Design an enzyme around this catalytic site. Structure first.
Site, PDB file in Angstrom:
ATOM      1  CG  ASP A 142     -19.282   0.203  23.802  1.00 47.73           C
ATOM      2  OD1 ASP A 142     -19.217  -0.972  24.227  1.00 47.73           O
ATOM      3  OD2 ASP A 142     -19.880   0.514  22.743  1.00 47.73           O
ATOM      4  CG  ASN A 164     -23.833   2.205  13.364  1.00 47.54           C
ATOM      5  OD1 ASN A 164     -23.258   1.938  14.420  1.00 47.54           O
ATOM      6  ND2 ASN A 164     -23.187   2.366  12.221  1.00 47.54           N
ATOM      7  N   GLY A 208     -25.787  -1.549  10.797  1.00 47.40           N
ATOM      8  CA  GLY A 208     -25.048  -2.106  11.926  1.00 47.40           C
ATOM      9  C   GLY A 208     -25.559  -1.745  13.311  1.00 47.40           C
ATOM     10  CG  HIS A 245     -32.136   4.770  23.307  1.00 47.50           C
ATOM     11  ND1 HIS A 245     -32.692   4.670  24.558  1.00 47.50           N
ATOM     12  CD2 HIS A 245     -31.920   6.099  23.101  1.00 47.50           C
ATOM     13  CE1 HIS A 245     -32.837   5.876  25.079  1.00 47.50           C
ATOM     14  NE2 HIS A 245     -32.370   6.762  24.219  1.00 47.50           N
ATOM     15  CG  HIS A 276     -26.179   4.243  20.306  1.00 43.94           C
ATOM     16  ND1 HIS A 276     -27.266   3.526  19.859  1.00 43.94           N
ATOM     17  CD2 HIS A 276     -25.084   3.564  19.895  1.00 43.94           C
ATOM     18  CE1 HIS A 276     -26.849   2.465  19.195  1.00 43.94           C
ATOM     19  NE2 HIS A 276     -25.528   2.465  19.204  1.00 43.94           N
ATOM     20  CG  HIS A 310     -20.612   4.138  18.463  1.00 47.34           C
ATOM     21  ND1 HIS A 310     -20.325   2.975  19.141  1.00 47.34           N
ATOM     22  CD2 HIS A 310     -21.812   3.941  17.872  1.00 47.34           C
ATOM     23  CE1 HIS A 310     -21.305   2.112  18.970  1.00 47.34           C
ATOM     24  NE2 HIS A 310     -22.221   2.674  18.203  1.00 47.34           N
TER      25      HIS A 310
HETATM   26  N1  LIG Z   1     -24.923  -2.882  28.886  1.00 48.35           N
HETATM   27  C1  LIG Z   1     -24.183  -2.105  28.062  1.00 48.35           C
HETATM   28  N2  LIG Z   1     -23.501  -1.034  28.543  1.00 48.35           N
HETATM   29  C2  LIG Z   1     -22.758  -0.247  27.738  1.00 48.35           C
HETATM   30  N3  LIG Z   1     -22.636  -0.465  26.408  1.00 48.35           N
HETATM   31  C3  LIG Z   1     -23.268  -1.504  25.788  1.00 48.35           C
HETATM   32  C4  LIG Z   1     -24.096  -2.404  26.607  1.00 48.35           C
HETATM   33  N4  LIG Z   1     -24.594  -3.331  25.766  1.00 48.35           N
HETATM   34  C5  LIG Z   1     -24.132  -3.058  24.516  1.00 48.35           C
HETATM   35  N5  LIG Z   1     -23.338  -1.965  24.529  1.00 48.35           N
HETATM   36  C6  LIG Z   1     -22.637  -1.346  23.365  1.00 48.35           C
HETATM   37  O1  LIG Z   1     -23.542  -0.723  22.446  1.00 48.35           O
HETATM   38  C7  LIG Z   1     -23.055  -0.876  21.102  1.00 48.35           C
HETATM   39  C8  LIG Z   1     -24.116  -1.508  20.204  1.00 48.35           C
HETATM   40  O2  LIG Z   1     -23.698  -1.460  18.829  1.00 48.35           O
HETATM   41  P1  LIG Z   1     -24.388  -0.440  17.770  1.00 48.35           P
HETATM   42  O3  LIG Z   1     -25.875  -0.568  18.049  1.00 48.35           O
HETATM   43  O4  LIG Z   1     -23.927  -0.907  16.404  1.00 48.35           O
HETATM   44  O5  LIG Z   1     -23.853   0.925  18.125  1.00 48.35           O
HETATM   45  C9  LIG Z   1     -21.812  -1.756  21.148  1.00 48.35           C
HETATM   46  O6  LIG Z   1     -20.633  -0.974  20.901  1.00 48.35           O
HETATM   47  C10 LIG Z   1     -21.845  -2.361  22.538  1.00 48.35           C
HETATM   48  O7  LIG Z   1     -20.526  -2.596  23.039  1.00 48.35           O
END
Ligand SMILES: Nc1ncnc2c1ncn2[C@@H]1O[C@H](COP(=O)(O)O)[C@@H](O)[C@H]1O
Lengths: 101, 101
Positions: free
Chosen positions: A28, A82, A88, A93, A95, A97
């Site tokens: 991330d 989430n 949140g 897509h 994913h 954490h």
């Molecule tokens: N270009 C990117 N490359 C890697 N991680 C990203 C990018 N853009 C957003 N994120 C991460 O994706 C997550 C989006 O938050 P959430 O959708 O709540 O899991 C956050 O932790 C961001 O830091």
């Protein structure tokens, strides 16, 4: 057309941790823990509600491979996903954490 | 001997949300969200590292059943599990937190 989809299609770079025929993991860019990885299915699915059990079995297997590669398997880590904007979710897509520290 | 194991056995009561042959869900007694449920395998397993993919497939299926019973499936929810004391795990039996937005 979405940030993780762009990564999957190779339009934008990333710090790839591990990759499989069905999954991809990478760091991330805005870490919230010492080690912060993301695990995503290459298949186009929006959130946890839209993953089949069969595929989540294979993801669970893949997750064990990631945490072991990162060396946090035995130190300890958090698993989080989430489902929906109201919980949140910012990128639409599926994913997970992975955090540890 | 442990608080969730006691619930499984059934030494101590709980607010059961849903149950089946392999899994059990119930409300957290110290909620951190409007709706806060816990999903646990009846089998004696300590954390996410010690679940087989086959069983996590069946848990994923079970998780969809609980969020839809709670009526938060479409409103939005968080899925969380802590692996090890260093990631904040307090009760040493595999459990997923289901929190709502
Ligand atoms: N270009 C990117 N490359 C890697 N991680 C990203 C990018 N853009 C957003 N994120 C991460 O994706 C997550 C989006 O938050 P959430 O959708 O709540 O899991 C956050 O932790 C961001 O830091």
């Amino acid at each position: 057309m979405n940030v993780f989809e762009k990564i999957i299609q190779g339009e934008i770079p990333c710090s790839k941790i591990l990759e499989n025929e069905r999954f991809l993991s990478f760091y991330d860019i805005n870490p919230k823990a010492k080690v912060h990885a993301l695990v995503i299915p290459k298949q186009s699915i929006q959130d946890f509600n839209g993953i089949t059990p069969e595929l989540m079995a294979q993801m669970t297997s893949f997750i064990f491979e990631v945490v072991e590669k990162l060396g946090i398997k035995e130190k300890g880590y958090k698993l989080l996903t989430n489902v929906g904007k109201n919980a949140g979710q910012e990128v639409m897509h599926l994913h997970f954490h992975i955090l540890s520290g």
